[PDB]
Each structure stands twice: as structure tokens, then as C-alpha cells.
From a paper:
Clostridium thermocellum has extensive potential in lignocellulose biorefineries as an environmentally prominent, thermophilic, cellulolytic bacterium. Previously, five putative sugar transporters, denoted A to D and L and belonging to the ABC transport systems group, were identified in the genome of C. thermocellum, and the solute-binding lipoproteins (SBP) of these ABC transporters were shown to bind different dextrins by isothermal titration calorimetry (ITC) assays. To gain insight into the structural mechanism of the transporter specificities, 11 crystal structures, both alone and in complex with appropriate saccharides, were solved for all 5 putative sugar-binding proteins, thus providing detailed specific interactions between the proteins and the corresponding saccharides. Combined genetic, biophysical, and structural studies have provided solid evidence that transporter A and transporter B are the major glucose and cellodextrin transporters, respectively, among the five potential sugar transporters in C. thermocellum.
Considering the importance of transporter B as the major cellodextrin transporter, we further identified its cryptic, hitherto unknown [name]-encoding gene as clo1313_2554, which is located outside the transporter B gene cluster. We therefore suspected that Clo1313_2554 represents the [name] subunit of transporter B. Therefore, we deleted clo1313_2554 using homologous recombination and obtained the Δ2554 mutant. The Δ2554 mutant lost the ability to grow on cellobiose and Avicel, in a manner similar to that of the ΔtransporterB strain. Therefore, the same phenotypes of the Δ2554 and ΔtransporterB mutants imply that Clo1313_2554 is the missing [name] subunit of transporter B, which is the sole cellodextrin transporter in C. thermocellum. To better confirm the function of Clo1313_2554, the crystal structure of Clo1313_2554 was determined at 2.8 Å resolution. Clo1313_2554 presents the general α/β-type [name] domain fold in homodimer form, similar to that of other NBD crystal structures. The ATP-binding Walker A motif from subunit A and the ABC signature motif from subunit B were approximately 30 Å apart in the structure, indicating that the nucleotide-free homodimer was in an open conformation. The crystal structure of the [name] was solved, showing that it represents a typical nucleotide-binding domain of the ATP-binding cassette (ABC) transporter. The [name] subunit of transporter B was identified as the encoded product of clo1313_2554, which is located outside the gene cluster of transporter B. Interestingly, this feature is found in many other bacteria.
Residue numbers in the entry:
A (entry chain B): 3 to 101, 107 to 270, 276 to 369
B (entry chain A): 3 to 269, 275 to 369
């Protein structure tokens, strides 16, 4: 367990890098820190590790306050992008720096075969490059059985398909040792599967802390909504209008009827509507059931992937991206009848940019 | 335009590698040859290129028979795994070769080489040598020696095999953009299936030497002619179970295990009562509550065992009775291992094959 109570970090010149970071990681938890560059996500990790000092706040590991504890005295394994293995040491010895009980150390180190480095086991760092030397750094930390793991983009020099293989082995390791993990990555796509809870940070402030599913389906503001999930969620200005007992959203000359179950102090007001691509669907089941919420749009580019078909269109004056089932019939220039799934509409304040529900 | 009329190739020992290969490529067309290893796809290219002889049949590039024409007199551009760039020549000279001894247009060779370089954004590499380049750049350079040929056909034998995951996709879309630019016939051979759905005008699926099907990407995907095309194109693989067709009233139902799926009015005779193989793709086993209300008749309970969230999709792996099935649904599903899920089978997208003959009934 690690707790950060009201933690600040200020840079030279008074600039605030991390602003009131409060969060309680329970033990045996996988927490992911995502956010744009300079959002303070990397800074907090260096502070939990003890590489930067904590200007203000408290940091506890278990029960012990460690703000002024040297990194070596925290029982933490760290992998950062300065992994920097020693050039004139074998792969084994470069992973065997756990001070120790030799001849069992080897067993655990050979078990690092999970990283597919067993065929490099007696090599030296210069013969590997890019991805392989980063998997060596991982290995070093992998055999440490610490109280918490701290990882800063440890799979960034690897290629797609091998990064995926090592992400599943990190998750299995957390499932096996059940020690706290704090994982930092630029990629968002690796947050949604790995972490128990995800923390979205922006310009030093944490926007939201929730489970991957909850971040995806209940964002707190337009930023989190437009930061998690790709391609970016579609955004339009819309006016809420009550017609009869129905509640409608109007943007351009188009008309979306919200389902009975939505709402008070925003009726007649103009809001921003948010729908994700996979909720603009063209299969005709939806075009008959959600007939009230079908809109005609002029397709401009289509992209077929085998997993999906992404359709980029323009409705009245606004560009929209849609995700439909693989191998679609749409082509650039035609106008297609898309249905907006009102049950998946997000509504934010135009000024505060936070959600109304 | 390229035509291959009844073309065969047999190996030492009498084994036939290519068996009655027939198809007429229209000019300015992108054709893809896909199939398992040793399906003869590489052999066919080697025969179009002139590197192997044609045992029987007729090859016509343009309007002329070229079975006995040397490759170099065939007006062919080739990017194969043979095309090692010349080690001690600049990429420029490596792109100006062939053109340099096909009746040198010295001035008109610089102009064309640099237009092919500007298309591939390799002009800032014109003075580097192949050993200084990396795999991806030399695959762009190798392509470049072919744009300067202005050929009648381009021949590509797995030219994106030496690349890593992301790079591949980047140079495929560049080829699709490239064919859309030169508007010359392309014949492309690749191992990966995913570009059935991405690259080609028409696709040829080959199996054990035979052409299984020649069709457009959508039609290849949506109307496979046999279980092989059905299970070779599309990922994850299409689900297959043995089922028996049964006529109850004028409805027609399909039964496998304890479950019963009713086909819509429009599916007919001379296969009813017999055991068939059913084929449905994962994106047609789907759990959205829209499906369970319209297609309540064809809702099935299945025990989830593994789920994989990808951001683009959610893959759900389930067992029904003794049978296994996979479904592809929206990115963040709530189904988790141990639960039982209520999936709807989209009857309008079920494929039915002969159990013995293994070819499609419709």
C-alpha cells in the first residue's frame, strides 16, 4: 500500500508541476498514470521513487512516511527509461544485481525467460539494441519481489507485437506476486487492460481516477472524454429542447431524441454533445429501431481494417467519425443513413466542459 | 492487362504446383494472390515474371503470348526478395539502373528517378549507399527502381515481409495510394490475409495449387465459396459447428447441440434433414440489447471463458454445450470470465456448407 496525501511539486521559478496529488493506492493494485507530456505524470513517479524531493505533502509506503527516505531504503523496484545497463557485464550479471542467496538467484533469473531473452543470456549489452536491452532492464526488476513496482514507459523501445506480449507478462506478474504496481505510459491503449484504476492527469491536475471501463463510459469532463478512446470522441454544440414529454438534442438541422430517463437547469440551453464512433452505427437493425435518430451524412474517407470499418463523414457542417462492422459498403461521395445511439450520448457544459450527468 | 489461359506447372516428380490457373486481369488493376504456404502463389508469379517455365497453358501480357519471352523483354517491374540493391552504388544509381542500359535517356533518367524519389520521399537519401540504409528505406528504394521502369505490370512477391508491425501498414497504404497514382496493373503476393480487406481490386485465394475463388474484397469476405475461403479470410477465424437443418412448419431451423437457430424467410430444399456445417463470423454473434429484442428467437446462452479488450473491439471466447465460439463486440464489454452471456446469432449472416463436399450450399 502507498498513499499520497496532498502532494505538490514545484519547479524552479515557482512553476507547479504536480498540484495537490491525493490518491490512496491499496496494496496489490495496478494503477496507471496517463496524460499528455508535462502533465506531471512522470514527476510523481520520480517522487515516489525518491529521485525528486517532495516540496509539500506526505508519501507513505505501507504505514511508514518516506518523504525523506533514500530511494535504496524504500524496497521498491524501478524501471525508467534511463535503464542503462552496464556495458561490460553479461546479460545474467546485469540482471543479477540483487546484492542475495546465489544459486537460487539463477533460477529466478532464468525464469525471466518470460521476456524471451534466454537466447541472449550470456550476451553483452552492445550486441543487443533497442528492444532487447529494455527487456533486460525489466528482468533486473522482475526478480526483486519488492513492496511496490514503479515503471516509467518500460515497453517503449519494443515493437508492437512484442510490446503486447510483455504487457500480458507484467499483468500476470502482478496477478502472481500481488504487489502494488504504479505504471506510467504515454499510450492510452495499454491503460484500459492492465490497470485496476487509471488516473488521468492534465497540466499537473488529476482529472479523474476510476476503472478503465468507468473512465471510458463515465468521463467527468470533455478532456477525459476526448482523451480516452481512439479515434477521439465526436463533439458538437447542441441545444437541449423539450418537445412534449420528450427531450431532444438539436445541432445544425439534425434532431436527436434522448431516451426517457434523462432529466433540469440546462433545458433550452446550448450544450456540447459527445458520442463515440462505435455509437454511430449503420447496420439496418439500428436504422429501423432508432429511426427517429437517423441522420444523413456525406462520406469523405473510409478505412477498412478487418477489425472494423471507420467511416469519416460530414453531416451538416460537422465532421464525424463512425465505427461500424468490418467490410462496409460505404464509399467516398455517397450519403449514408447513420443512426445516433442516444443511450450513449454524453452532454457537457459549454463553459466548464464538465458533464451534466 | 494480363491473361493466363489454362496454365499449369508441374514439379520434378510429376507433382502439379499450379492446376488450371485461369483469370483475365484488366489493365490498371490491383490483383492479390493469397493462400497458405506452397499453394503455388509464388510459383504463379515466377511464371508471370518469366523465371520458371510454363508447363502447359498460355500467358498473355497485353495481347502477346509471352511464355517463351525472356523476363527482361517482357516489360515487367519486379520487387522480389531477389532485388538486393547494388551494394556499392548510390540509391540514385540503384534507381537509375536498368534504365541506364535500356537505351540511356541520360537527361530523361534524372527527371524520372527524381520524380520516383519525390513520390516516396527518399530524395534526401539519393547519395547514401544500400549498406547505410535500413530495411524500410531499402524497401522504398527497391520500389523506386520500379517506378522508373514505367512497366506494363508490377510484380511484388511479399515485399513487406522484412518490416515490423507498424511499418508494414504504412507501406501497404502507400502501395494502395501508389497504384491509385500510376494506374498500372499490379500483381501482389502476400502471406497475410488482412489485405484481402485492405489493398486489392480483386483477390485470388489459392489452395494446394488450385484457385479457390476470385472476387472483390467484400464479396470474398461475405460470400465464400467453400469452408476454406470462409476460414482463411477474416480474423478471428469464422466459427464452425456441425448442424442439422430441420423443417418445422414453413420455418427452417438449424440445430447443433441443444440449441436451435431459425433462419429468416428466404432461406430451401434438397438439403433439409441432413447434417451440415454452420459458419458464422464473430461480429455476427453479438450481445447488444438491440439484437436480443429483435432476434429473441435466436438468442443463445454461453459461458464466457476468456475476454480480450483491444480498444477497437472486445473479443469474447465462450462455450455453448461442447462447442466453442468467439464473438467480436463493442470496445468495453462488461462480460468477464465465469459469467454466462446472452448473445444473439444473426441468422441473415450464417453460412452453410456441405459436411462432406465442404462447399457452400448457397
Amino acid at each position: 500500500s502507498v498513499k499520497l496525501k496532498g502532494v505538490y511539486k514545484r519547479y524552479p521559478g515557482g512553476v507547479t508541476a504536480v498540484n495537490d496529488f491525493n490518491l490512496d493506492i491499496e496494496d496489490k493494485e495496478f494503477i496507471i498514470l496517463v496524460g499528455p507530456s508535462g502533465c506531471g505524470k512522470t514527476t510523481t513517479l520520480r517522487m515516489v521513487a525518491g529521485l525528486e524531493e517532495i516540496t509539500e505533502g506526505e508519501l507513505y509506503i505501507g504505514d511508514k512516511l518516506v518523504n525523506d527516505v533514500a530511494p535504496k531504503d524504500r524496497d521498491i523496484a524501478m524501471v525508467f527509461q534511463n535503464y542503462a545497463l552496464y556495458p561490460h557485464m553479461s546479460v545474467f550479471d546485469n540482471m543479477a544485481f540483487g546484492l542475495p542467496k546465489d544459486e537460487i538467484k539463477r533460477r529466478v533469473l532464468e525464469a525471466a525467460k518470460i521476456l524471451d531473452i534466454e537466447h541472449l543470456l550470456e550476451r553483452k549489452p552492445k550486441a543487443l539494441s533497442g528492444g532487447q536491452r529494455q527487456r533486460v532492464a525489466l528482468g533486473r526488476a522482475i526478480v526483486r519481489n519488492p513492496k511496490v513496482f514503479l515503471m516509467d514507459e518500460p515497453l517503449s523501445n519494443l515493437d508492437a507485437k512484442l510490446r503486447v506480449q510483455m504487457r500480458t507478462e507484467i499483468s500476470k506478474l502482478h496477478q502472481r506476486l500481488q504487489t502494488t504496481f504504479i505504471y506510467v505510459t504515454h499510450d492510452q491503449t495499454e491503460a484500459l487492460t492492465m490497470g485496476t484504476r487509471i488516473v488521468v492527469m492534465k497540466d499537473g491536475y488529476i482529472q479523474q481516477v476510476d476503472t478503465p471501463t468507468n473512465l471510458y463510459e463515465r468521463p467527468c469532463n470533455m478532456f477525459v472524454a476526448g482523451f480516452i478512446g481512439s479515434p477521439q470522441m465526436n463533439f458538437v454544440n447542441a441545444r437541449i429542447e423539450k418537445r412534449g414529454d420528450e427531450m431532444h438534442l438539436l445541432f445544425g438541422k439534425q434532431d436527436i431524441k434522448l431516451p426517457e430517463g434523462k432529466a433540469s437547469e440546462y433545458v433550452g440551453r446550448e450544450v456540447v454533445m459527445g458520442i463515440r464512433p462505435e455509437n454511430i452505427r449503420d447496420e439496418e437493425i439500428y436504422l429501423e429501431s432508432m429511426s427517429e435518430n437517423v441522420v444523413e451524412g456525406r462520406v469523405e474517407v473510409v478505412e477498412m481494417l478487418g477489425s472494423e470499418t471507420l467511416i469519416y463523414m460530414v453531416i451538416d457542417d460537422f465532421e464525424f467519425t463512425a465505427r461500424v462492422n468490418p467490410r462496409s459498403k460505404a464509399r467516398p461521395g455517397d450519403v449514408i443513413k447513420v443512426a445516433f445511439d442516444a443511450n450513449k450520448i454524453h452532454l457537457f457544459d459549454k463553459e466548464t466542459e464538465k458533464t451534466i450527468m
